[PDB]
């Protein structure tokens, strides 16, 4: 519903454009496959899953992306070096253009994932997730040797759940570090930093998450986004209220698909909308808020990159 | 995430406070009842309806509003002068404090309801919902005699589908030259002018609808809202895609509910969320954005009117 004065940078990773003024480029819906307790992953430690039944989940996002025009990016979660290596190996053989966040909670795996991506040549399509404030010295070493050029920087200021804390952990750095997390990325060889707001639980710093979306875009200009569905997933009241009603998912879904829409209208450029199995409910909701953003942009004077494949044209 | 410079006017209508800075007051949730093809309504012309399940649809919202903290207001919808009088008599006979919007498409019915509420004694509660450019001399002359001090000023320029067009019908006046609708209402007794942004359908004026929420609020200072769910219910593409999915409602509801959360974060003070049967899905979603709006209010400097009953403290 607004345009930004600070010239927004747009990063074209593997045919997907991250960044730009609100409405210039469509929102980049980032799915999540092989997450914790995925129904297709049989052997989580060894990375053994149902390869035939996973291509159907991906082809559901591919076909719905061609109707709405919303670009899609995978996020291959893994917890062991062997598992994430077989997950990455499968993904690049079924599709050859779409980027993938190599996400993991253990820095050893992201260390292993970074080496494998450059080993087999698919490194310009890999987004390292994420360069947070707890990154150790070993993780920098493997990242800078690797050929990964795009990475997600997590605007996490642990003892500062405020907008100024998120700015400070990227600008000056927080506690336990001396350089801003947006400059640690530069020395890691990341030419394409992509800020993550690090959404906080509801009632413990959730308002700063949504007010940092138009603040970390009008201050840095780099692509801004994150996983906002974690706010409704950590909500204790909803987890209790939704069980009383006959359909637990009928009530939780509008709230879970409402965190993205609220942040999208505030200027978010990509949405870690969670499990891949929610494709048919997030795309209609997100492409709607992209018609709203693609209308103000056409009226506020913002130029749209590809108007023919915008949700404001295909779906109107 | 906003804090308007223009001082926002708070109107108290039977305990439901309309307006204020984003986060100052909990979002009002107007709920349409007795609408077209309501299951309870059996004779749409003599206003028969169930009158037993009708309480069940109204007690549900009271209990939810006493769990979330969001104010609740009814919107009585009638098509004939006899039908609308039948609904007001029932509603005032079950609830004695909550206001209502006597809504109707025809002018002669709205005037009849506004005149009827004066004779019954409940007209400080009526929120008679039309002050539009398509108003005849008959309706303004009966609304002046009736003791209705609140009205929903609808900012609908048929000629100009822009945000400037919304301003001009309120301040200067368009089709129906001079005496803008915000200045017609003052001269027909309306003491509490509540602004409606007149949500235009998706693809034509749906961008000006969301950018008018922070525009008309920061220009006039009066409470801002509207029926944003009409943007999604009148979407042609969604109707086609929805009917192919196994569960048509589970695809549509996140989109329909998302029209309100998107406009709520912009600064909307009340939300016409549609049928009252959707009360279990809009309250959790709207209350989630009030926690988010109730935290930036305590960070930007806004003073929450009653912290002990805000969704930021009742929930979480």
């Amino acid at each position: 519903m607004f345009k930004f004065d600070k010239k927004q940078e747009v990063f074209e990773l593997g045919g997907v454009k991250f960044g730009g003024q609100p409405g210039e480029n469509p929102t980049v819906l980032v799915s999540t496959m092989f997450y914790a307790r995925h129904k297709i992953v049989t052997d989580e430690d060894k990375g053994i899953f149902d390869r035939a039944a996973a291509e159907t989940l991906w082809n559901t996002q591919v076909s719905l992306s061609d109707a709405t025009g919303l670009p899609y990016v995978n996020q291959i979660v893994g917890e062991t070096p062997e598992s994430i290596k077989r997950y990455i190996e499968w993904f690049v053989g079924i599709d050859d253009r779409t980027p993938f966040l190599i996400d993991s909670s253990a820095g050893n795996v992201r260390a292993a994932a970074a080496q494998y991506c450059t080993e087999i040549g698919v490194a310009d399509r890999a987004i390292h997730n994420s360069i947070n404030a707890s990154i150790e010295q070993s993780e920098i070493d493997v990242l800078t040797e690797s050929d990964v050029s795009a990475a997600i920087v997590l605007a996490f200021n642990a003892t500062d759940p405020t907008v100024k804390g998120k700015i400070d952990i990227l600008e000056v750095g927080g506690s336990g570090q001396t350089k801003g997390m947006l400059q640690v990325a530069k020395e890691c060889g990341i030419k394409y930093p992509i800020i993550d707001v690090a959404a906080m639980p509801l009632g413990a710093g959730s308002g700063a998450t949504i007010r940092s979306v138009p603040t970390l875009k009008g201050k840095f200009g780099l692509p801004i986004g994150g996983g906002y569905h974690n706010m409704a997933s950590a909500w204790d009241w909803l987890r209790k209220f939704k069980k009383t009603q006959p359909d637990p998912k009928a009530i939780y879904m509008p709230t879970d698909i409402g965190t993205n829409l609220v942040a999208q209208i505030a200027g978010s450029d990509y949405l870690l909308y969670g499990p891949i199995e929610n494709v048919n409910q997030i795309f209609p909701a997100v492409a709607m808020v992209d018609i709203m953003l693609g209308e103000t942009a056409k009226e506020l004077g913002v130029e749209i990159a590809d108007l023919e494949n915008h949700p404001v044209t295909k779906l109107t | 995430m906003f804090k308007f410079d223009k001082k926002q006017e708070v109107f108290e209508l039977g305990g439901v406070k309309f307006g204020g800075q984003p986060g100052e007051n909990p979002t009002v949730l107007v709920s349409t009842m007795f609408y077209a093809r309501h299951k309870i309504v059996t004779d749409e012309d003599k206003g028969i309806f169930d009158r037993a399940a009708a309480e069940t649809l109204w007690n549900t919202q009271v209990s939810l509003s006493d769990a979330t903290g969001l104010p609740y207001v009814n919107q009585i919808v009638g098509e004939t002068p006899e039908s609308i009088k039948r609904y007001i008599e029932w509603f005032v006979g079950i609830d004695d404090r909550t206001p209502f919007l006597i809504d109707s498409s025809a002018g002669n019915v709205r005037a009849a309801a506004a005149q009827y509420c004066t004779e019954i004694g409940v007209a400080d509660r009526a929120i008679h919902n039309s002050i539009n450019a398509s108003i005849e001399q008959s309706e303004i002359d009966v609304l002046t005699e009736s003791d209705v001090s609140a009205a929903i000023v609808l900012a609908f320029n048929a000629t100009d589908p822009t945000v400037k067009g919304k301003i001009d019908i309120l301040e200067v006046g368009g089709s129906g030259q001079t005496k803008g609708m915000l200045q017609v209402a003052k001269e027909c007794g309306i003491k509490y002018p509540i602004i409606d942004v007149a949500a235009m359908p998706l693809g034509a004026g749906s961008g000006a609808t969301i950018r008018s929420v922070p525009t008309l609020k920061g220009k006039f200072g009066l409470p801002i809202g509207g029926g944003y769910h009409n943007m999604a219910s009148a979407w042609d593409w969604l109707r086609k895609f929805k009917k192919t999915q196994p569960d048509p409602k589970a695809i549509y509801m996140p989109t329909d509910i998302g029209t309100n959360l998107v406009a709520q974060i912009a600064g909307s003070d009340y939300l016409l969320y549609g049928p009252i049967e959707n009360v279990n899905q809009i309250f959790p979603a709207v209350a989630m954005v009030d926690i988010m709006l109730g935290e930036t209010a305590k960070e930007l400097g806004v003073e929450i009117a009653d912290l002990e009953n805000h969704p930021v403290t009742k929930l979480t």
Partner: peptide
Amino acid sequence: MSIVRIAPEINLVMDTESGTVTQERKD
């Protein structure tokens, strides 16, 4: 015309007449 405040820290602010999200100049 409304200077809608969204970030007093970095001085960021909206501008409702133009729709821009600018930064209030102290000058």
